[PDB]
From TrEMBL, chains A, B, C:
It comes from the Viruses. It comes from Acinetobacter phage SH-Ab 15497. This is Major tail structural protein.
């Protein structure tokens, strides 16, 4: 099979670890994927006179895959909602406690029917998200999922596997960036990085070969902010304890639709200006987001889409 | 000295740690080497007002060297026999227990007589072996050895150091149409990797700068198999518990002489088809070999040489 | 700010952690520096029902700067004296105990006055030194320091910040015909590496954000010596316990002035002639220096400057 002809679809699960009766598989616009499963190994230490390798025994299997997707409007909304464990309300999303389990199907168009091109992964729950914003570079959102187990390859797709398509809105660009840092101050930051962690780990019991359930952890928001040393206001906020805020907006290709990420309470963990021989002096300022009561959360994503 | 004018000769030892009376040093066709000795250090911890470095003391020594050689017929047979710890029988070798110690002599041809070019190592025992098979790439067998101690450089070669030569048979290539994976199924694997370990470790006692003996460890045979995702049979064998077999034959060339490696019982530890950004989908399937009572061993090398 | 317009100065402190009344800031000849402070984080482990980020707390702070400078005469002299903890006597320096603290000032000429270009670092103490000598390559000396805390950026320089300029002499070259290894033997070594460690670690107490003092450790001198395998005398000094000496001099074109580094007692920790396929055979021979009572120290730097 080749990476050129591949299709990926997902459906919200009503019962954990099972595909719905008529799965509404939805197309997932993406670039590269590593979704797969991992099986444990129980080695045998039986003594052998000829030192012959005794062998190993298989163990519980867990689906683990990382998918890379470009940020765009009318897309990745379910992924963000499930990851934030919240609900899209008034085009605004806040980190809450609403876990969502999905069933992802990997269909290899190039693979023939007899070759079983359908690979179904169930119990898949979004766990980690990586957001990177670089000037003149498409904004991409990497997604890490925790799946309970995978089904055997089969020629026939899941019964009633309706394949919904994904709106192909122009990918978001880094221009017209509303990068705010103070109460009303606009920062001169060049790149911006955001990481989201749900801390979802699996739980195995006697007589099971998969994670009956996945233990979610605390919602964690952190990131890295890089700017130029030309601005000296960023310097000091790290030296002296100061709680600033972060607020940036990704721009579409003049489509009139856009998002808005806001971190009301953050504190700088680092920040060091280095001569670095010749050339302009940069400034990397990693930060740690913390719970803010005004929004009853740590992060708030808002769609201003037209 | 330069690597161009370099040669290595080895002789089977009758008494461990000693060169035989009339060593039949045999030429070892090789590419590069890292064979040498390592001496431990015993630091001294004593308080000093001037805070001056107290000093460290030399400890036990261990000869450790890695030798890279291209796989070819009528060559490396003694290395394979010694490593496998078995004995060549009917052009077939199965992992045994018989341990063989050798004495390796490094002779820098460019180095002058007064410059002491001869380097002698005693107690050298083959510990590990790395076999890599790549398409349109010569098959090379890497060899790791464990020696007791290195003899001081001298001008005169060991008394009666007869220098036997090695048959310069054409290096084994990868152009074979025989790579078996099932009972009669021929696999479409692209590269194949095999690793062998003897778990040999040295033993130290009071009043001995060198290792008197080496406690041999369990015989270990494992490997990695990479193929194309086009074949879907291998896919799923990782997910389910299945014990397959591996059987591949390196081809010397037009001459009928060839080597046959067989692993009667293996199981796959991993396996993952990744779409990636673009291009074809590959498939890496690591495996671990296990004891098969039919051959009363883990691996069986067979020469079909004409 | 850009790395093109930056000035770095320093002044000997009379009281630890404080800039002198009128600092005689002296130009620091260097290629690049990383002078900056680092603050620890105290995370809060309070369980939250909405699983929100509790937030972290700032902890103690310390200043670390990497001063990369090119070795040259009439320069880094105070740096060498402070690092060696000795006193320049008869143009000869021996590892002593007397500790020296300095106040480093980084001035970004390009940064405007209102932009607060002056950066002051107090309690800076030279700790590590890395000297590398390569043929047809300028001798470089890296300087690691341990500072107490970083003063806030201000427009006005420290009161009476007289800016002395270190004498600028042609950088030292590797073209010397004097590299001694035996009692009178001249070695054929190609590169030479020297590392100096003072073991300065910071000390924290209750109610102090900064380190009140630094408990210095013992003086540590070690290095690495690389040569060619053409000389077989170096071989064996590692195999059989032998205590040699090292003595090398850096040259300054036709200026005449020079530095002389001497290690009266060293022994070699490694040594390995590697064939490496083709080309010449090199020989890396790491060594550790120790206490020699003839000089009452480990290392003795001597200026023969005209």
């Amino acid at each position: 099979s080749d990476g050129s002809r591949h299709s990926m679809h997902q459906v919200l699960e009503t019962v954990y670890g099972e595909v719905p009766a008529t799965p509404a598989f939805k197309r997932i616009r993406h670039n590269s994927t590593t979704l797969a499963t991992a099986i444990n190994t129980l080695t045998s230490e039986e003594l052998r006179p000829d030192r012959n390798s005794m062998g190993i025994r298989h163990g519980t299997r867990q689906v683990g895959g990382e998918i890379v997707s470009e940020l765009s409007f009318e897309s990745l909304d379910d992924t963000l909602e499930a990851l934030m464990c919240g609900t899209w309300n008034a085009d605004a999303l806040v980190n809450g406690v609403t876990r969502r389990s999905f069933s992802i199907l990997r269909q290899f168009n190039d693979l023939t029917s007899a070759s079983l091109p359908n690979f179904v992964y169930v119990g898949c729950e979004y766990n980690t998200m990586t957001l990177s914003i670089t000037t003149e570079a498409i904004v991409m959102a990497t997604f890490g999922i925790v799946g309970m187990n995978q089904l055997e390859p089969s020629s026939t797709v899941p019964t009633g596997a309706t394949f919904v398509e994904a709106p192909t809105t122009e990918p978001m660009d880094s221009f017209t960036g509303h990068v705010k840092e103070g109460l009303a101050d606009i920062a001169v930051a060049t790149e911006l990085e955001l990481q989201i962690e749900n801390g979802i780990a699996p739980r195995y019991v006697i007589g099971s070969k998969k994670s009956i359930k996945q233990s979610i952890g605390r919602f964690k928001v952190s990131g890295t902010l890089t700017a130029y040393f030309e601005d000296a206001t960023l310097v000091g906020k790290f030296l002296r304890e100061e709680a600033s805020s972060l607020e940036f907006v990704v721009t579409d290709g003049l489509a009139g639709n856009s998002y808005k990420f806001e971190l009301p309470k953050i504190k700088y963990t680092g920040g060091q200006p280095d001569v670095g021989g010749e050339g302009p002096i940069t400034l990397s300022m990693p930060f740690v987001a913390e719970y803010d009561p005004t929004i009853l959360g740590t992060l708030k994503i808002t769609r201003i889409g037209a």
